[PDB]
Amino acid sequence: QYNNQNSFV
Ligand SMILES: C[As](C)(=O)[O-]
């Protein structure tokens, strides 16, 4: 299973 959560703020 693959999860990549990115946040740029
Ligand atoms: C190798 As996969 C994208 O089925 O977790």
Ligand code: NA
């Ligand atoms: Na997988």
